[PDB]
Design a protein around this ligand. Structure first.
Ligand SMILES: O=P(O)(O)O[C@@H]1[C@H](O)[C@H](O)[C@@H](OP(=O)(O)O)[C@H](OP(=O)(O)O)[C@H]1O
Ligand SMILES: [Ca+2]
Ligand SMILES: [Ca+2]
Length: 1119
């Protein structure tokens, strides 16, 4: 305890260490680091002072000693950066699958040791800190993020902006210190929610006998019949040692804050411990947390394989992980997804990662699913490395030779098992006996896979697409992954008094609307003295003007106010008079705030001062890509619209300007220019960013880039003026046209070949390949899955290499189709060798019109022996509990339906089944695990890197047991009558009736710049007969503390042993779409009753800071 207070006190002082950026362009550099205790952040002051970096300690997942990091690996042979493991350590932090890393280089080995032990305690105390203290640190984090920390007092509009950044919009405007800021927060959170229906509930206070009456009458906490128990419960909440030495008391607002806190969670934390009693059934009786292609960080085709993903999965409590082993460059296999562009990591590194992390989250057994493409020698090296590195951790022999069933999880604690094909006794080949020429159309069975490039027909940039060639088709995806600068210089505003009036308007509106100081100013070009300038500044509610003289005399420039000092640049003049007063119109004034320009949009490619809705729509409908956009002024003042194309249709939204800001819905920006720049970087509508500014120039040049056998149409007659020129008549189609800049193209017409003609005497015929493909009847299950954009029928295509490339791409081929004149796609590869490979294989596809296993590795396979699935062995003496079978999603669906589900249940009570996603989910999306689980499948393998609903259900299921990774399947479903498609199979199992009312929410996260308009979807997920969804209405412009109207919900669950209660918070955005904000999913068996908090998670299932709902939940039958 004293050691902890000593430790924390030392790091708030600090330490200096070198930083290895997770960015390549950057070169390592040093800074000082410290732990602001009042907020629990790791801040790194750049140099002993200014604060330039920060990490929230609550996001730290691992503090790892050594140089084990990607950053470190980027400089491991550079001798300038070959540090020492003793001097290096790594913080892994974040709330997504791919954790962020802080890779640091210290000097002492007790320096690193204190930090590591400091953060370890800090991490644990921050995470379990009582909620009033977490709120208190959040309030400080918001505070130390504006002008406060300096003046120690923030403005009143700083508050408006900070509140909007935390999802709260005050109706209209209404300096403050932290104590007053925290007072305002607590008062706002309570006032905004005093309307919630709370029968139990002018800052009154609730006492001990009152809180005890609550816990008992409403919360069903029977322990609270002991008063001293509640006493501590209330003191475990407040955590103020003052006010403690008297009877505990809550204020009303502290009671409401309690109702929202993790201390009031709907989730019974008693189910967070392992129940060792439930860990004694055969392995086949457990749901086992399982990962598919564990090495991958992203999609299945081109993402990075990472050691870090193994560590993340095992630390999320995953127990069955997957290794895809291929022959490596040095006799040691590599791991990556075969036949793709995913990066390769080394088998040896993976094993050490697995060793280091397999039992941090759980003592329970780990299963390595080994997809093996290695030669016999590399299989031997694997077998040798498994045995050496894992030692007694590896399972090498059965637990019970006379058993008739798999061993229990308890019997396999701290064991790692190998799942791998096994030789028949005395054979050199697996007894493999399944004959299936139903070759799945996926990237495994394709002819060639790769990334190739396609010119965008609108901006003429090359973009990468995934290409897949099969034996008859090419599938391609959607695209993959001086003074004039100064704010105070406004240039020429007008040519006469119009410019003076514009300057007076700009300066006046700025000063009035912002309460700007005297001396606020702008500079413009002089309307009266050419080459000179005019300074305008605010003084006594009036605008003052003075001439700034300019002289190019004797070579160098000379700027000066009349009768005043001479300066070399306009910047120097202004910078000087912002520090000491000028004299102007007999007045003394120091320049202060620069007046910003407000109409920078007026010269942008996308801006149209005069344009109707109908004209904008006609313009954008000429553009065959989504993200075509323009901004138009509207007929009413201070009003604009964005017009943009999405899903082949045109949409519009109004942008209103209110003073020095602009608004789009509730999203506030500084200017139209800043607004558009924001939505070029972030999506505006669904996943659509603003990409192409549409004006006359852009429209003219659309689809103009073809090269292969191009035709053009003569617009006029042309008589050859030289012997190398073509002669032709109006409307003539000139063929095979070679296009070049400089005004002259080359083509065939009238018998003459490749003669020159004027470029602007023709229009280029349309290349239909530039148009969007019809995507409505496109194959849902191509090798590309949901990423598919287009299909080409190879026998109807022709291919030709362009030897000179095009558009700064050296390696280009052209696909055409003889029966569709002028249809052509130009396609670039990254290398001449890649180009040659694609061309030869495509052309070959067109001209068509029609495993040994090392004993040393085999010996390590004790259980989890893969055999072809034999439905007829189910229930007979021929079923071997050591044999297992794997099921690709689509095959598994054939067994988890009404017809075969009960027999799949029978199989799974004795033997393991592994389910994994279909090959076509190249995007690493996940299938629904519940229909697999409810038929007793144990190894339901999901892409852990993907933040979708299947992974949210996975982490929810394994919440029972605290993510130990094994959950005992309930006895009712290991009954032989249990049928997931027949609730009559359950017999008289008591059902469960849930009544819920969503009362309010706090600290909801944002989805962009606006303020969310949230609604809550409540779901029960189990068998089909139990599954249903309900939702609340959305509330307007509030994520910080919304409350919802009355809408009582009822759910009835016939099988509460396989049932999940799921809460999803959505926002209704301005386009009437519904966007995920947060979620919490629970097994129904762990639900408490009463007025309960619902602590909210992100889509990766990480705890959000403070975010929660308050519900009223009643469960029947009564406990
Ligand atoms: O890596 P991909 O492309 O997703 O390929 C499938 C997937 O990874 C499965 O997890 C794997 O299951 P099993 O090892 O459990 O069988 C299967 O192996 P298989 O070809 O040996 O059946 C692979 O085909
Ligand atoms: Ca695999
Ligand atoms: Ca990791």
């Amino acid at each position: 305890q004293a050691e902890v207070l000593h430790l924390c006190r030392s790091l708030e002082v600090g330490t200096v260490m070198t930083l290895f950026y997770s960015k390549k362009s950057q070169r390592p550099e040093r800074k000082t680091f410290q732990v602001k205790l009042e907020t629990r952040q790791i801040t790194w002051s750049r140099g002993a002072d200014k604060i330039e970096g920060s990490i929230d300690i609550r996001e730290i997942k691992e503090i790892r000693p050594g140089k084990t990091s990607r950053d470190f690996d980027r400089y491991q042979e550079d001798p300038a950066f070959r540090p020492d493991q003793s001097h290096c350590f790594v913080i892994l932090y974040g709330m997504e699958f791919r954790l962020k890393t802080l890779s640091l280089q210290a000097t002492s080995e007790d320096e690193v040791n204190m930090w590591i032990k400091g953060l370890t305690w800090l991490m644990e105390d921050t995470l379990q800190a009582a909620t009033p203290l977490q709120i208190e640190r959040w309030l400080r984090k918001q505070f130390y993020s504006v002008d406060r920390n300096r003046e120690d007092r923030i403005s009143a509009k700083d508050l408006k902006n900070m509140l909007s950044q935390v999802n709260y919009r005050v109706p209209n405007m209404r300096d403050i210190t932290y104590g007053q800021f925290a007072q305002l927060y607590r008062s706002l959170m309570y006032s905004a929610q005093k309307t919630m229906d709370l029968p139990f509930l002018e800052l009154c206070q609730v006492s001990l006998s009152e809180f005890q009456q609550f816990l008992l009458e409403y919360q069903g906490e029977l322990w609270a019949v002991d008063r001293l128990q509640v006493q501590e419960f209330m003191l475990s909440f407040l955590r103020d040692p003052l006010r403690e030495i008297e009877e505990p008391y809550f204020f009303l607002d502290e009671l409401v804050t309690f109702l929202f806190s993790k201390e009031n969670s709907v989730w019974n934390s008693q189910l967070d411990a392992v129940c060792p009693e439930t860990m004694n059934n055969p392995l086949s009786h457990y749901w086992i947390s399982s990962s598919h292609n564990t090495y991958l960080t992203g999609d299945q085709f081109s993402s990075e394989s990472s050691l870090e993903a193994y560590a993340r999965c095992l630390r999320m409590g995953c127990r069955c992980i997957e290794l895809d082993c291929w022959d490596g460059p040095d006799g040691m296999p590599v791991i990556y997804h075969g036949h793709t562009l995913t990066t390769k990591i080394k088998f040896s590194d993976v094993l050490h990662t697995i060793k280091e992390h397999a039992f941090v989250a759980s003592e329970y057994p780990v299963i390595l699913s080994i997809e093996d493409h290695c030669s016999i020698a590399q299989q031997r090296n694997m077998a040798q490395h498994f045995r050496k590195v894992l030692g007694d951790t590896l399972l090498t022999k059965p637990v019970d030779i006379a058993a008739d069933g798999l061993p229990s999880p308890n019997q396999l604690k701290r064991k790692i098992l190998i799942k791998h094909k096994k030789l028949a006794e005395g054979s050199a080949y697996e007894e493999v006996p399944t004959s299936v020429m139903y070759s799945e159309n996926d990237i495994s069975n394709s002819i060639k896979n790769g990334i190739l490039y396609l010119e965008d027909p609108v901006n003429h940039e090359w973009y990468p697409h995934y290409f897949v060639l099969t034996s008859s088709k090419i599938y391609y995806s959607e695209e993959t992954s001086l003074h004039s600068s100064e704010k105070w210089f406004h240039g020429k505003l007008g040519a006469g008094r119009d410019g003076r009036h514009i300057a007076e308007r700009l300066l006046t509106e700025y000063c009035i609307e912002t309460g700007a100081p005297d001396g606020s100013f702008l500079v413009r070009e002089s309307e009266t003295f050419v080459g000179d300038y005019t300074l305008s500044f605010w003084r006594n509610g009036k605008v003052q003007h003075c001439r700034i003289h300019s002289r190019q005399d004797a070579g160098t420039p000379k700027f000066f106010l009349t009768d005043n000092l001479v300066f070399d640049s306009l910047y120097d003049l202004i910078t000087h008079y912002q520090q000491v007063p000028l004299r102007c119109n007999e007045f003394e004034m120091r320049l202060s705030e620069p007046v910003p320009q407000t109409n920078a949009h007026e010269s942008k490619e996308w801006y149209h001062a005069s344009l109707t809705r109908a004209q904008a729509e006609h313009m954008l409908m000429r553009v065959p890509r989504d993200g075509a956009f323009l901004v138009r002024k509207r007929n009413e003042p201070n009003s604009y619209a964005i017009s943009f194309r999405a899903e082949g249709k045109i949409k519009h939204c109004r942008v209103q300007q209110e003073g020095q800001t602009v608004m789009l819905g509730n999203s506030e920006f500084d200017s139209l220019v800043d607004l558009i720049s924001y939505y070029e970087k972030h999506p505006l509508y669904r996943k659509m960013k603003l990409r192409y500014p549409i004006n006359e120039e852009a429209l003219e040049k659309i689809g103009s880039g073809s090269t292969f056998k191009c035709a053009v149409k003569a617009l006029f007659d042309y008589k050859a003026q030289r012997e190398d020129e073509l002669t032709f008549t109006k409307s003539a189609i000139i063929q095979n046209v070679e296009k070049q800049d400089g005004g002259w193209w080359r083509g065939d017409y009238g018998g003459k070949k490749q003669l020159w003609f004027p470029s602007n005497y023709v229009e280029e015929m349309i290349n239909p390949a530039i148009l969007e493909p019809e995507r409505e009847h496109l194959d849902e299950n191509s090798p590309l899955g949901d990423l598919l954009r287009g299909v080409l029928d190879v026998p109807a295509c022709q291919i030709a290499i362009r030897p000179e490339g095009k558009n700064n791409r050296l390696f280009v081929f052209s696909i055409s189709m003889p029966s569709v004149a002028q249809w052509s796609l130009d396609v670039a590869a990254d290398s001449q060798e890649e180009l040659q490979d694609w061309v030869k294989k495509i052309r070959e596809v067109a001209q068509t019109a029609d495993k040994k296993i090392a004993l040393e590795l085999s010996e390590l396979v004790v259980y989890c022996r893969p055999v072809p699935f034999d439905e007829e062995k189910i229930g007979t003496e021929r079923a071997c509990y050591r044999d297992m079978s794997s099921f690709p999603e689509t095959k598994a669906e054939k067994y988890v339906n009404k017809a075969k589900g009960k027999k799949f249940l029978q199989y799974n009570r004795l033997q393991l089944s592994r389910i994994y996603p279909k090959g076509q989910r190249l995007d690493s999306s996940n299938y629904d695990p519940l229909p697999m689980w409810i038929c007793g499948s144990q190894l339901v393998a999901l892409n852990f890197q993907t933040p979708d609903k299947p992974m949210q259900m996975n982490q929810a299921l394994f919440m029972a047991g605290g993510h130990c990774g094994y959950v005992l399947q309930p006895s009712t479903m290991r009954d032989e009558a249990f049928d997931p498609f027949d609730k009559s199979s359950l017999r008289g199992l008591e059902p469960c009736v849930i009544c819920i009312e969503v009362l309010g929410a706090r600290h909801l996260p944002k989805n962009g710049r606006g303020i969310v308009c949230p609604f809550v979807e409540i779901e029960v997920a189990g068998a089909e007969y139990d599954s249903t969804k309900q939702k609340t209405e959305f509330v307007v412009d509030n994520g910080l503390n919304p409350v919802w109207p009355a809408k009582p919900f009822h759910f009835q669950i016939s099988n509460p042993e396989f049932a999940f209660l799921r809460f999803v918070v959505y926002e209704e955005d301005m386009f009437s779409d519904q966007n995920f904000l947060a979620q919490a999913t629970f097994p129904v068996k762990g639900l408490k009753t009463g007025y309960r908090a619902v602590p909210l998670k992100n889509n990766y299932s990480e705890d959000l800071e403070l975010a929660s709902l308050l519900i009223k939940i009643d469960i029947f039958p009564a406990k």
